[PDB]
């Protein structure tokens, strides 16, 4: 734990420093997401300032992502013919919990989360595997799920504290990828800075993971 002396917590890093001090202090029990996480120059309770959109991930999305969508009933039949690489009932969650992780993502929809949740939030959590309305990886139309992750995009959108965050990659990256796709969100939110927002909108940007600590970076490396 004290390995948490490698990150200085004032300085300001690269973007390529800090991937390679995310793989350096990365555990190696399981493959952690990293995040990126902005403070933005809005005003978060006034809608014309909302910061939403996509990123297209130069590594990592698109037909290649193994995607596991977990439905129920006629939702199941979506999944399929949306070209999710496997899908399951509820059923698959024991083959989870048995040691079965073929897959890279998760997708699922609204009915089968509270079972998901339950048996696997201390499984996919640490992992960042789990799926969010909010990333836009829970919902009925399972199908546009799939289809924008095998198109390769991403969705993100600010939280009240006028912060904002997306997954980014894996710790198992090689750095070069990760450096690649953290510079790519940072273009992508760029990209969504609202009309009428003054100020600095990229106020602090960090590298992250839920159980480690953030690296801050300059956007602009």
């Known amino acids: ?31 952690e997401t990293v995040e990126v996480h902005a ?43 949306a070209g999710a690489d496997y899908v399951g009932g509820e059923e698959i969650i024991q083959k989870i919990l048995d040691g079965w992780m073929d897959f890279d993502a998760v997708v699922a929809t609204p009915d089968v989360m509270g079972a998901v949740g339950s048996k696997l939030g201390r499984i996919l959590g640490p992992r960042g595997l789990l799926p969010n309305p909010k990333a836009g990886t829970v919902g009925f139309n ?15 959108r600010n939280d009240k504290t006028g912060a904002i965050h997306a997954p980014v990659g894996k710790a198992s990256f090689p750095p070069e990828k990760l450096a690649d796709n953290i510079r790519a969100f940072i273009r992508a939110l760029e990209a969504h800075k609202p009309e009428g927002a003054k100020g600095t909108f990229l106020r602090s940007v960090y590298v992250t993971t839920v159980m480690g600590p953030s690296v801050r970076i300059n956007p602009h490396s």
């Open 39 to 81: 403070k933005l120059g809005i005003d978060p309770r006034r809608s014309d300032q909302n910061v939403r959109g996509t990123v297209s991930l130069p590594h990592g999305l698109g037909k290649q992502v193994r995607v596991l969508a977990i439905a129920k009933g006629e939702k199941i039949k979506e999944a399929e013919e």
């Open 142 to 156: 399972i199908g546009e799920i799939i289809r924008e992750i095998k198109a390769g995009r991403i969705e993100f």
């Open 1 to 31: 734990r004290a390995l948490l002396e490698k990150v200085d917590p004032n300085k300001i890093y690269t973007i390529d420093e800090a991937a390679h001090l995310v793989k350096e202090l990365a555990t190696a029990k399981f493959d």
